[PDB]
Amino acid sequence: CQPTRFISRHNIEGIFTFVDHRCVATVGYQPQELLGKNIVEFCHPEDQQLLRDSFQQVVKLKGQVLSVMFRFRSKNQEWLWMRTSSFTFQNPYSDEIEYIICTNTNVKNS
Amino acid sequence: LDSKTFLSEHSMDMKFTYCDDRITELIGYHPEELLGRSAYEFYHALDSENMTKSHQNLCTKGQVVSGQYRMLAKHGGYVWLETQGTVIYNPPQCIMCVNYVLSEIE
Ligand SMILES: CS(=O)(=O)c1ccc(Oc2cc(F)cc(C#N)c2)c2c1[C@H](O)C(F)(F)C2
């Protein structure tokens, strides 16, 4: 069985700037319920800081993968465990600000 | 009543741009640590869809009473509050919130 997972892109603050529509079946929100909001707003109070420090670190790691586990509030208001694997991308023909590519998977905490 | 009422100001995306110091002796937060952050970071999960609805009412009507919601206190537990929100437009520039603390802590 394939895990449910969706792709998103964020700015360095954490704001969703792109959402893969596989999110409907993963967390039950439509893409536009995600777009423009920070990922920290769907996150469990106990895990918000770790997620903030994750986004801060992802940019210092030379575009290598950073993984984080946190509880994400589905459109049902249920806490789902997510593993978000993230990395920076920065097109080297330019000097535009790097952004963050995330893969977001519903995993088991056990 | 009065010593349980504080003002906050928000951008149209719900981030704090200002908060009365009074929020310290009631909920624990320092105002400075509040700015740049979505109010959304702070609602209890069970009030979240309701606040979203009030926010929609607030943007469409221009003034709303939130009805009852819980805010994650600074040092654990949740405080109940009721807020009156008012959009200040100029000639939407910001949201003024009058925030009344219903309960003590948890
Ligand atoms: C929905 S409402 O009543 O206008 C409202 C209430 C609290 C609101 O923010 C606040 C202010 C506060 F002191 C504590 C909390 C919490 N938790 C949220 C907001 C609103 C508006 O959405 C807003 F954008 F201005 C932000």
CATH number at residue B45: 3.30.450.20
- DSSP states of chain A as a string? -PPPEEEEEE-TT-BEEEE-TTHHHHHS--HHHHTTSBGGGSB-TTTHHHHHHHHHHHTTSTT--EEEEEEEE-TTS-EEEEEEEEEEE--TT--PPPEEEEEEEE----
Short-list B76, B34, B14, CA closest to A41: B14
Rg (C-alpha) for chain A, rounded Å, is: 13
Q: Where are the domains of chain A?
A: 4-110
Atom of ligand 1 nearest to the CA of B65: 3
Do residues A35 and A6 lie in contact, with contact meaning Cβ atoms separated by under 8 Å? no
Q: Enter the resolution in angstroms.
A: 1.9
* Strand (E) or helix (H) holding B84: strand B78-88
- The identity of residue A96, as a single letter, is E
Which residue range is the domain that position B76 belongs to? 1-106
Number of neighbouring beta carbons within 10 Å of residue A22: 15
Pairwise CA distance, residues B71 & B43, whole Å? 5
CATH architecture of the region A4-110: 2-Layer Sandwich (3.30)
Amino acid (one-letter) located at B11: S
Cross-sheet strand order for the sheet of A99-106 = A16-19, A5-10, A99-106, A79-89, A66-73
Helices (H), B8-62: 24-27, 48-61
> Does ligand 1 have an atom closer than 6 angstroms to the CB of B66?
yes
Q: Do B38 and A38 touch (CB under 8 A)?
A: yes
What's chain B's Rg over C-alpha atoms? Answer: 13
What are the C-alpha distances in Å from A96 to residues A16, A62, A76, A91, B53? 18, 15, 38, 8, 37
What is the position in ligand 1's atom list of the atom closest to the CA of B86?
Answer: 4
**CB atoms near residue A47 (< 10 Å):** 19
Distance separating alpha carbons of residues A16 and B1, to the nearest angstrom: 39
Looking at beta carbons, which residues of chain B come within 8 Å of A73?
A: 45, 48
Interface contact flag, B40 A77, Cβ < 8 Å: no
The experimental method is: X-ray
Q: What domain count does chain B have?
A: 1
CA atoms within 13 A on the CB side of A70: 24
Give residue A79 CA to ligand 1 midpoint distance, Å: 23
User: What is the C-alpha to C-alpha distance for residues A76 and A59, in angstroms, rounded to an integer?
Assistant: 32
Tokens representing A17?
């700037």
